[PDB]
Amino acid sequence: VLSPKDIKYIETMPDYIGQGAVNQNMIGDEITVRDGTY
Amino acid sequence: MKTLRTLKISPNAPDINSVWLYKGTMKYFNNGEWETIG
Amino acid sequence: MKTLRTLKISPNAPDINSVWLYKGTMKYFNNGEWETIG
Amino acid sequence: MKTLRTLKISPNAPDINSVWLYKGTMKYFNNGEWETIG
Amino acid sequence: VDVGCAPDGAMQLWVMEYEVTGIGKGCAMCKAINPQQAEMLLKSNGIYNGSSYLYKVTRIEQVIVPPCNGLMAEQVVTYKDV
Amino acid sequence: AMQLWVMEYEVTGIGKGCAMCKAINPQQAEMLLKSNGIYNGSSYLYKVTRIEQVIVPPCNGLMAEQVVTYKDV
Amino acid sequence: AGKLGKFQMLGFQHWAPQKATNLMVQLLAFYRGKS
């Protein structure tokens, strides 16, 4: 059922050389980030 | 920079890419005119 | 001896196998030094 | 009309189809003799 | 290293090669805040700054100070190059 | 390892040159050029003609210039 | 024609977070020993 325009969406996925190392509202527009967690 | 391959002996102006050799002059095209060396 | 086949018009010096032409002076390369013709 | 193409340096007189250079004396074959330019 | 100069707060030292057209070639070392500023010092405080259009600058490269002694830069312009 | 020395010199018969060293005194800034330069096998050709120190508070200025022209060759 | 130095070699007497790679970087601004 996938059209060829949809496999190209599945083909343009992220593939990473690797490492080496619920929907909630906001009351406020302030975010603190810590080690890639928002 | 502007290479002139041949030298043409004639009473007539040969070409801008030649050296015009009359009797006792060596004329070549520079700044839009034949400049004599001597 | 050394046969030259070209003539060059430049403010710089050409290679040793060409005749230097600049604004009314003529030079050529013998014994390591650009010898003027005049 | 007659095109000289090569310049030949020599202390003595080379062929009539080329230009002679010696110490700064440009000599080429015109009117049956070696005509110096200057 | 933080002396209070323009390019990020430090001193930048430069090598310059060029070609004075109609004249010859040469070297120049300068302390200059920019590479554009380095070629502006050749056209203002060089030997040929009067007719400053002769300078055809072919290379502007930095000199980095090593942590110890050593020859940092060298640029010979030989007679056979000219 | 103290301070930076810009030297104008002249290789004898081959051409002029510009240099930049880091040494304690200009007897050591000339030593670093004759021992590590490209004329290391012909270090007697080095004729050092001007040495000046790199003083920082201008930081906008020429420190060497040496043009080899068509009439020095 | 001249050499602007790319590297300086010092002794050990004359002187952790994450790593981008796990093997060392053989720089091209460094001579290598020739067997």
Q: From CA E43, how far away is CA F41, in angstroms rounded?
A: 36
Residue C31 DSSP code:
T
Q: From CA A37, how far away is CA B8, in angstroms rounded?
A: 82
SS3 state of residue C27? strand
Please indicate whether, in this complex, the C-beta atoms of G21 and A21 are within 8 angstroms of each other.
no
Chain F positions in Cβ-Cβ contact with residue G3 (cut-off 8 Å): 38
What b/e sequence results for B16-35 when a residue is b if at least 16 CB atoms lie within 10 Å of its CB, and e otherwise? eebbbbbeeebbbbbeeebb
Chain D positions in Cβ-Cβ contact with residue B10 (cut-off 8 Å): 1-2
Contact D31, D25 (CB under 8 A): no
List chains adjacent to chain D, taking adjacency as at least 3 C-beta pairs closer than 8 Å: B, C
Backbone torsion region of residue B5, taken as left when φ is above 0, otherwise alpha when ψ lies between -120 and 50, otherwise beta? alpha
Angle at F57 between CA F53 and CA F62, to 5 degrees: 55
Q: Can you name the residues that pair with D4 across neighbouring β-strands? A: B7
Structure tokens at F36: 């590590």
- Could you tell me which residues come within 8 angstroms of residue E62 by beta carbon, excluding any fewer than 6 positions away? E12, E13, E14, E15
Which CA distances in Å does A34 have to A16, A31, A37, A38? 22, 10, 5, 7
Please indicate whether, in this complex, the C-beta atoms of C5 and D7 are within 8 angstroms of each other.
yes
Please indicate whether, in this complex, the C-beta atoms of E73 and G1 are within 8 angstroms of each other.
no
Residue entry with tokens 């490269």:
E61
Structure tokens at G32: 């290598």
Give A15: exposed, middle or buried? Use CB within 10 Å, 0-12, 13-18, 19+: exposed
Give E65: exposed, middle or buried? Use CB within 10 Å, 0-12, 13-18, 19+: middle
Q: From CA E44, how far away is CA E24, in angstroms rounded?
A: 18
What determination technique applies here?
cryo-EM
Chain C positions in Cβ-Cβ contact with residue F15 (cut-off 8 Å): none
Q: From CA F19, how far away is CA F64, in angstroms rounded?
A: 9
Count of C-beta atoms within a 10 Å radius of residue F32: 19
Residue E53 DSSP code:
G
Q: From CA F70, how far away is CA F2, in angstroms rounded?
A: 39
Closest Cβ–Cβ partner in E31, E45, E63 for F59:
E31
Backbone torsion region of residue F30, taken as left when φ is above 0, otherwise alpha when ψ lies between -120 and 50, otherwise beta? alpha
Distance from CA of C3 to the nearest CA of F (A): 23
Q: Is residue G8 within 8 angstroms of chain E, CB to CB?
A: yes
Count of C-beta atoms within a 10 Å radius of residue G12: 5
CA atoms within 13 A on the CB side of F25: 1
Structure tokens at E70: 């050593």
SS3 state of residue B19? strand
DSSP labels, F3-41? EEEEEEEEETTTEEEEEEEEESSHHHHHHHHHHHSTTSS
Which is nearest to F16 in space by CA: E27, E4, C11?
E27
Q: From CA F18, how far away is CA F34, in angstroms rounded?
A: 13
Q: Is residue D22 within 8 angstroms of chain C, CB to CB?
A: no
Residue C2 DSSP code:
P
Chain G positions in Cβ-Cβ contact with residue E67 (cut-off 8 Å): 8, 10
Touch test G–A: 3 Cβ pairs or more under 8 Å: yes
Which CA distances in Å does B10 have to B32, D17, F25, G21? 20, 14, 69, 75
Contact E2, F30 (CB under 8 A): no
Whole-number CA gyration radius for chain C: 9
DSSP labels, chain D? -EEE--EEE-SS---TTSEEEETTEEEEEETTEEEEP-
Chain D positions in Cβ-Cβ contact with residue B25 (cut-off 8 Å): 37
Amino acid at F44: Y
Q: Is residue B17 within 8 angstroms of chain D, CB to CB?
A: no
Closest Cβ–Cβ partner in E61, E78, E81 for G4:
E61
Question: How many Å from the N-terminal Cα to the C-terminal Cα in chain D?
Answer: 22
